[PDB]
Amino acid sequence: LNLENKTYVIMGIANKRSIAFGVAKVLDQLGAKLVFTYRKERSRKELEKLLEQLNQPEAHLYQIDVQSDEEVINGFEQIGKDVGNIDGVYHSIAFANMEDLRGRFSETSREGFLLAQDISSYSLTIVAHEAKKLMPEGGSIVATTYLGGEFAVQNYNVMGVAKASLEANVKYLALDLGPDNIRVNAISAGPIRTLSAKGVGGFNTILKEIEERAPLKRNVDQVEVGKTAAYLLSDLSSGVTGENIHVDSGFHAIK
Amino acid sequence: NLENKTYVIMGIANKRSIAFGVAKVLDQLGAKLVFTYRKERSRKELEKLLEQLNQPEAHLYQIDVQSDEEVINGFEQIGKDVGNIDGVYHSIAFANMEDLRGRFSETSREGFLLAQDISSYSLTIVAHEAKKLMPEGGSIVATTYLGGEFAVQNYNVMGVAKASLEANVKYLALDLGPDNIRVNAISAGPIRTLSAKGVGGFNTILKEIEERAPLKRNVDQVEVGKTAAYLLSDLSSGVTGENIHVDSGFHAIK
Ligand SMILES: NC(=O)c1ccc[n+]([C@@H]2O[C@H](COP(=O)([O-])OP(=O)(O)OC[C@H]3O[C@@H](n4cnc5c(N)ncnc54)[C@H](OP(=O)(O)O)[C@@H]3O)[C@@H](O)[C@H]2O)c1
Numbered sequence: 001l002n003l004e005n006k007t008y009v010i011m012g013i014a015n016k017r018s019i020a021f022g023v024a025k026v027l028d029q030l031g032a033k034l035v036f037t038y039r040k041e042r043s044r045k046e047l048e049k050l051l052e053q054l055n056q057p058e059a060h061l062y063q064i065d066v067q068s069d070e071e072v073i074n075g076f077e078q079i080g081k082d083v084g085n086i087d088g089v090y091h092s093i094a095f096a097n098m099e100d101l102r103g104r105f106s107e108t109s110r111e112g113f114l115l116a117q118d119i120s121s122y123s124l125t126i127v128a129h130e131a132k133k134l135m136p137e138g139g140s141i142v143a144t145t146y147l148g149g150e151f152a153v154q155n156y157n158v159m160g161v162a163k164a165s166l167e168a169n170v171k172y173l174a175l176d177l178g179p180d181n182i183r184v185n186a187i188s189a190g191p192i193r194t195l196s197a198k199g200v201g202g203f204n205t206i207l208k209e210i211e212e213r214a215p216l217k218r219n220v221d222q223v224e225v226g227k228t229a230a231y232l233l234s235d236l237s238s239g240v241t242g243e244n245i246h247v248d249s250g251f252h253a254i255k
Numbered sequence: 256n257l258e259n260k261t262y263v264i265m266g267i268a269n270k271r272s273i274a275f276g277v278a279k280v281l282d283q284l285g286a287k288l289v290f291t292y293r294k295e296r297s298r299k300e301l302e303k304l305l306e307q308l309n310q311p312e313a314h315l316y317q318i319d320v321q322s323d324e325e326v327i328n329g330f331e332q333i334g335k336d337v338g339n340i341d342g343v344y345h346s347i348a349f350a351n352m353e354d355l356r357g358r359f360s361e362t363s364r365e366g367f368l369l370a371q372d373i374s375s376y377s378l379t380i381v382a383h384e385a386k387k388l389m390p391e392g393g394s395i396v397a398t399t400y401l402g403g404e405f406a407v408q409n410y411n412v413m414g415v416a417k418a419s420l421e422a423n424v425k426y427l428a429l430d431l432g433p434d435n436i437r438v439n440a441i442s443a444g445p446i447r448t449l450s451a452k453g454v455g456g457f458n459t460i461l462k463e464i465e466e467r468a469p470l471k472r473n474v475d476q477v478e479v480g481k482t483a484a485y486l487l488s489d490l491s492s493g494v495t496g497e498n499i500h501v502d503s504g505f506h507a508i509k
Pocket residue numbers: 011012013014015017018019020038039040041043064065066067092093094095119144145146147188189190191192193194195196197
């Protein structure tokens with residue numbers, strides 16, 4: 001058990017209900033130095049207010065759009081020279097056009113397919129590459145995924161293929177970065193009412209099903225993901241890599 | 256935290272047992288520990304091994320999982336001596352060595368059923384009885400091996416018993432979920448224990464892991480203990496029916 005003198009980069013807080021914010025609250029209580037990245041200016045405004053944290057220099061805010069190689073390379077170069085070398089990265093970034101989830105999968109356009117792949121899956125590969133440069137003693141990289149990457153889930157469509165890609169990405173990164181003592185894992189979170197759940201019709205229906213069918217008979221929240229994230233980002237998960245942990249009330253395990 | 260938590264640890268034979276790695280960790284976390292044993296020889300080891308911080312504790316109970324009476328009576332005594340419990344670490348397995356040496360199609364009925372009985376059904380009765388001592392919920396964790404998911408050479412009847420145990424974990428998870436009891440499995444990589452010391456060419460497979468696994472090294476007992484600490488605590492709050500591999504990433508390759 002450490003975290004006291006350790007440094008973590010959290011990527012993908014948009015508002016107060018972001019999964020990544022749940023992660024931040026947990027790691028902050030354990031006393032970690034946190035570094036944040038954001039894409040939208042609106043997310044920067046939210047980050048500054050959300051620094052209801054115990055973090056001393058409420059700085060460490062970097063603009064990084066993972067579509068640009070330039071921004072991720074420059075972004076992580078800037079982190080290293082401002083903060084020093086890090087101990088881990090939490091990846092909480094995904095995107096698909098809403099029209100592709102409404103929405104007949106066989107109708108998915110090439111550009112719509114590649115966009116989701118680019119931001120939801122490849123982003124991990126490039127972030128891991130840049131993050132490695134700042135982990136000379138090793139570390140831990142965690143990505144957020146969903147059950148739709150393993151099974152065909154209604155409406156999830158193109159994001160499901162992006163998640164499947166991301167999960168395999170985790171495994172191939174684990175094999176490659178293992179010799180450097182960098183562990184790569186995933187969290188498969190259950191459904192949570194977040195900014196990304198906006199636009200998705202019948203979202204209450206799927207939360208209703210979890211409540212009624214999952215072993216625990218209740219939905220999960222951001223901080224539960226955060227506690228498993230803390231387990232994965234620390235030396236408590238020392239012998240664990242290439243793994244996908246379901247924080248979903250056991251829903252993965254049923255019919 | 257864990258200072259006001261009590262865990263039952265089943266399956267310590269000696270210093271190298273995976274379950275002693277678990278105890279080691281939980282004890283450092285300030286937990287009160289209850290141990291179960293089958294052999295009198297294992298009880299003597301337990302008393303030496305208690306280089307823990309469990310002060311005038313020595314919570315030791317003889318439980319042979321083959322006996323319904325011994326497990327029911329065992330947990331009734333635990334409940335009487337400690338009150339309520341917060342979790343169980345299950346680390347018991349057995350099979351006749353003849354079945355591993357050893358063509359799988361030649362497995363006898365007695366061998367098959369004995370390995371199922373001790374390695375798999377044991378979790379079911381323990382869970383039922385341990386539930387009686389978990390009014391507000393808790394966490395049960397079982398040790399499994401990758402041989403349960405894939406056909407591993409010479410693992411044979413134990414692989415079938417591990418596959419049975421993995422499903423057992425999932426069905427208990429669905430069953431005990433509403434009682435606020437989580438149940439999970441740890442899939443440990445190969446470790447030099449008393450049981451493994453019975454399998455020929457065990458050094459060969461440890462050499463294989465060291466060369467093939469992502470982390471390019473073997474795991475030890477305390478590493479399984481750390482993940483167990485995670486699974487037994489409220490840090491794994493929404494995690495149940497899961498199988499976590501502590502095996503240097505060997506599960507994820509070729
Ligand atoms: N919500 C759920 O039910 C659920 C369930 C399982 C898994 N997940 C996964 O959890 C992760 C977090 O999502 P969330 O639910 O917390 O919703 P969210 O707060 O909207 O998170 C998505 C984040 O990704 C960022 N992002 C999108 N495109 C980007 C780009 N090109 N460059 C950099 N950042 C970009 C967004 O930043 P901007 O808004 O600033 O663009 C946003 O902060 C996602 O990977 C999602 O797939 C969610």
